[PDB]
Symmetry: D2
Subunit: 449 residues, 4 copies
């Protein structure tokens, strides 16, 4: 076999993290083989004993990988033979690399997803708890990156938290389909020894078992779904990062990241470069790239198994490692950044209340169009008088519309502004309080899984 | 405004299919404005009556679009004003194009996914039912596009059906999240007039309402996951297409597509080009392209609303139409194609039973490796005698292993070969029958989801 | 035969813009057929005459598409036989839809690329001219969206013009490979009539002719690389858009877009939303999506022709139209935006000069590390005294290093700062002037080559 | 600084292959710094001497990376100080990791592209030599994976070599824009010491120098282009792989890969799995993913430098190694595969000559449509008689059309079939010979 090919087929450099799941797969199959009469009870106890030793060797970090090992599967097999001899060979009876490999990857992903979920719920909790605490802070809401209308800082934080919860929800749906046992599919047509797949399922703790052997061997839906979930999660993180990066500019001056998540220069110690957010933003492309690669790998392949499917591992390991690191950095960032309440408030300008002025008339019965026209005239009048709209006198306003009463002075207050949004999902305090409670409830339910 | 700029902001060219859901959204909002005391009952009646006439105008295809109409939303309000005058203007009180547009897209998508669900289930049902009927057919199973081991044709059909049921399940999940009311989120901070959102949900028939206004206005998760579901579904269809394209070659000779789903030449009337399968395969790229575009459009955008989000509609419409056509063509192809039981059985060779010969020894207590070696010797001895392994004598067999008895004759039978796989998911008849039943129940449960 | 199938094969709805190039390909082929003797010198005159009439019909929007016309070709074929009778049938002799279609697309792409080229070079020229005019404007140069060091506003504009000139260079390279005649490749094995491909090349104005019939029929390299060129150009435009969108925020306050390329509400007359820039940014994803789709369509297809290749037209047309519109809008944006020199200069702070304070020491022979430390100490001493570094007394500076002399005052000047960068391509005035010259020269070379 | 943060910011784990180019960049800069009066002649000698020793340490795989080393640049910096002391610190005067990093990546890519060019040209040459020698072989040409019309096996092999020759042309275009010196761009605004960039260009052997410092520092066009070229090249190898996989099925029986590039079972010793071709086919997705990631990384980023740009390296390294391995495996596969002339031969059937029968009439003045209808009648007839088209008697033929003369027999010959395509680019032997000469001339020029 060609040396370059042999090099392209090696995966020991990156698949060793499958050590433990590979062993659990073999212990379960060994027990199954014993039930099918392929192994005697004595042979079983010997194999299970050996496999257990191997497990403690990897766990203790004393397992020794040898140059001949082309992949984790061969490394474990060699080691089993070294410990117990020929008897070890009976372990492959009726089993194929085809069903043993997807079994290891799914078990690995299930464990990986549980860890990812934890870090994800922690990020969501951090935003929600921070929103509750800073619920009185108010700043500009933006559209087209232009100041549109006053909003509570907590409404901004919660919008990200809510998107992240849908990610957490997709994570749970993906895990459900991953939690299906493919072992017992053999190489293509099924397991030829009437192996007890229910025993395998129970032993490995999957929720159910695969419906069709050909599908179970060749489908990589679980890889794609995971990569899709990962990519959308990264899109959300890239948006939050873009926001924070812009809000942390000296021009905006709304917040500052902690030294732990930013870099600087002794020459300009006052300026902090948002490295952590740029890292997070850049990973969206890295993760999207993996999703794109696997989709093209799978596109147009014929049934059943084909070597092309081997590209799955590196893509999954990369995304798992990337998400684990970025979610934690994100939590650290949100948890430790410092907001400048002063600057957020100073960014609120009277010009941003002209819509509320029109809304003031709408509530008194003035038709939408009129109310808008009256507010336009107020803005123009302030202009000509050289002042801002919150400074026009009652007489100035009455000159535009009799509908303006002295209470219109309540319009010119940023708390009264955000407090008009009591309709569900709005930025009024009660609405924000309601979201925090809905999110805490959602997190509980997703934690219970 | 700049003429090229104007053209770039025009969606009227393709967004007219939203005319109906736009009107319904407006009717619901009109009613909520009345409850909020923004409209009188008299005003509500006049607005609703006008919206109804516009709906009819679109329906009867008599609506007249004016060169001044930038988009469907502008066309409808223009027409409503023409019909009922000044009063039409109050309808937009507290509403934004921002929450109005996402509302129309989700309403459109919900109706669209309902139709796609129906075609997807019909495709799965066609695969499952043909599999029950052709359950006795046996043909080669392939790995690396090389004959591996005998399998039932139905096992092959069912592998695709199973994959498509997961697609169906994903569709169900996407639909749940699309079925959430975004109306009443206003331009960014929410609806400013204490609008009754529960009422909006009731009128528009959504299952729940959006939790956060900024999110509801800026997220396009629903477009992305619909495109993800669509792309994975296309991968499955592209694989089934590739299989069928190869099996329809004169070289394999396994099946032939009907005339309705293929093309031919009057110079070679016996040959058929699998056009339908090629189009289906090609749509995987087309659909994937939309998924890729929307992910890039969304990446790095700041909160909250930005014009970039307008790229959503064309991608959704293209994929909705692509899946609808593709799923129906796939159903027709699977339904009408003709298999050659003769060519499929013919492809089954004795060499394909060497594995079964090893398993024969395994079951008689011979260790895995020794059994494999034993079968290899037999394969080799047959090669030397210029005969197929099923022609070796019992005595020749015993010379390789005393574990070979006269019943080894049972190994050289393709029905017996496939019948070995009785473990759940296998190709044995009882396993296939169990799959058919499981899928029938799954389709029942999924069809009930709606 | 199937209804859904036929709809999927219909392209007349979008491929009509290929009307004229299809007729040109036909005229050139007719002529070659006469030379080969397939058409008498008389039939030729009648076929060419019938073609010029069809050309005229489309040219006047007079043409009428029948409900039976599945594509532009079939429409032109129907119209010719319908104009000159049976004779129009001899035109397909030896020709195939396979080599006829790629010929039409390449001709179309060649004309479209010359147009894109003009709009692209115009954008580049606009950036360069504006750089020449506003060469005295200085503002902060950013990294990590944090102020790093002073730069000339012109250096920023030229950084974008330089990237675009590479796109222009790539465009020319793509045009060269598109400028190769595929006609005469037949359906797969070539043309069976020994047609004069040199005549076809000369008549249709291609630079050379395709080397292999199978490759010419099956490759879509030209589509892929046109789309790659377009995606990278869009990446460049998405970056310029992002910068300008940020610079136009009220927070930065560096520039304002003209009314033609932005939108605003009467309620906040001073607010301008950068619509043009957002649309441009959003097209990066739309274009990337097309590239993504064609790559996926081509992946794993076997030789030679397959119906999958039909997805090429829609991806090309969308990107051709997108680029033509986007490039012109970008030109208008750059040409008409208004900068605030005052706000740009006011953003320059003394803290941005500590690096220059270190360089001051380095030029007096102090090692890099010691100079950096001394500047860091001065920065810190100022911080503790609650003053800016340009306000530290010489005595204070000498307490940090005796090497700081009275002439250190010159360090705290922003013109002096940008003027240190005389090395080729830096921001000093002479360097920026040199860049303008090289660009002017590059644009002339590319205009002259196009 | 946060530990997960530190791990993410660290590139040392993978950027070490830039060790030698990083050193070359430093040697060139050191030289220009001496000319600029920043370094004395002795300091220069000491710095160049230390840099050479470091080059040797890496070449001998004896270099010691320390826990504190964040990247290759910091590692070499640390090592030089260890070897020559305080003066090592003068080397970074006016330089930034921003212009240093792109200089190293371009130098590395320039070298990697020369290696890829070598393997790509060898693949093309291998296809061409094989097409020259198996020039008499004829088999079906396919459309929709259905037998369409006879063609020479060489025409098939050459269709792949032609597309690859365009990949080779693109590679040259990408290499030219990469061969532009970015060093001396500083961190953003340029080099602040009037460094002699022409001297840096000459020492590092670049063809020219970057035009604008901000562009030079922030653009990764060269990465995208390389990725675009690599992806299209993989598309091409993707198709070739798909073709060979199908042709290697027992159903087609056209060829069989050698043991070195396939796998098999002792249980079925006569069947070979073309895993070399499947590996090649799957790498298209691997490479496309890298292109997609970098495009997404760059989209929407503002000027000038941003940390996001650090994703460029791993994508480039993966694609360089993938292409290098895949190109050589493809060369071996084409060079060592065994074709079955007999089976390609048997694959040719009379049914595939009906279009030819129609052209035969066409060359006799009979109109396009009528000649077609005519061949169709000959086909229908032979069908009713249960015979192949080439068995029909001249009277059976004439009864359909008087234009059929005994010379119509020459039509039912597959060599005569492929010989009709003499027009440039066709499958006739003369055209195949011409293509072979044209490609050899192209490679000669692309090589020089």
């Amino acid at each position: 076999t060609d040396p370059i090919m042999e090099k392209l087929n090696s995966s020991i450099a990156y698949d060793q993290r499958l050590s433990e799941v590979d062993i659990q797969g073999s212990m379960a199959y060994a027990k199954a083989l014993e039930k099918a009469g392929i192994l005697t009870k004595t042979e079983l106890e010997k194999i299970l004993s050996g496999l257990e030793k191997i497990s403690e060797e990897w766990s203790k970090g004393v397992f020794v990988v040898k140059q001949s090992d082309e992949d984790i599967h061969t490394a474990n097999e060699r080691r089993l033979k070294e410990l117990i001899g020929d008897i070890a060979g009976k372990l492959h009876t009726g089993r194929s690399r085809n069903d043993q490999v997807v079994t290891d990857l799914k078990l690995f992903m299930k464990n990986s997803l549980s860890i990812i979920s934890t870090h994800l719920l922690q990020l969501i909790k951090t935003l929600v708890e921070r929103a509750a605490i800073e619920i009185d802070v108010i700043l500009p809401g933006y559209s087209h990156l232009q100041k549109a209308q006053p909003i509570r800082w907590s409404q901004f934080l919660l919008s990200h938290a809510v998107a992240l919860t849908r990610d957490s929800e997709r994570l749970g749906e993906v895990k459900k389909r991953i939690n299906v046992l493919p072992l017992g599919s053999g190489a293509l047509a099924g397991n030829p020894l009437d192996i007890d797949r229910e025993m395998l399922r129970s032993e490995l703790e999957f929720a159910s078992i695969s419906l069709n052997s050909m599908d179970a061997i060749s489908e990589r839906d679980f890889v794609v779904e995971f990569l899709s979930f990962a990519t959308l999660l990264m899109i959300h993180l890239s948006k939050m990062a873009e926001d924070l990066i812009i809000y942390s500019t000296s021009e905006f001056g709304f917040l500052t990241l902690s030294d732990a998540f930013s870099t600087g220069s002794s020459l300009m110690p006052q300026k902090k470069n948002p490295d952590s957010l740029e890292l997070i933003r850049s990973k969206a492309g890295r993760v999207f790239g993996r999703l794109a690669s696997i989709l093209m790998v799978l596109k147009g392949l014929p049934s059943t198994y084909n070597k092309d499917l081997q590209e799955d591992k590196e893509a999954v390991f990369d995304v798992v490692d990337t998400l684990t690191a970025v979610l934690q950095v994100a939590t650290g960032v949100i948890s430790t950044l410092q907001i400048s309440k002063e600057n957020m408030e100073k960014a609120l300008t009277p010009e941003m209340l002209a819509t509320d002025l029109a809304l003031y008339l709408v509530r008194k019965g003035v038709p939408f169009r009129q109310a808008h026209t009256a507010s336009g005239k107020a803005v123009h009048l302030a202009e000509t008088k050289g002042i801002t709209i919150n400074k026009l006198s009652l007489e100035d306003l009455k000159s535009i519309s009799p509908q303006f009463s002295s209470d219109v002075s309540q319009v010119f207050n940023f708390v009264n502004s955000v407090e008009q949004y009591t309709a569900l999902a709005g930025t009024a305090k009660s609405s924000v309080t309601t979201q925090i409670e809905q999110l805490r409830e959602l997190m509980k339910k997703q934690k219970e899984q």
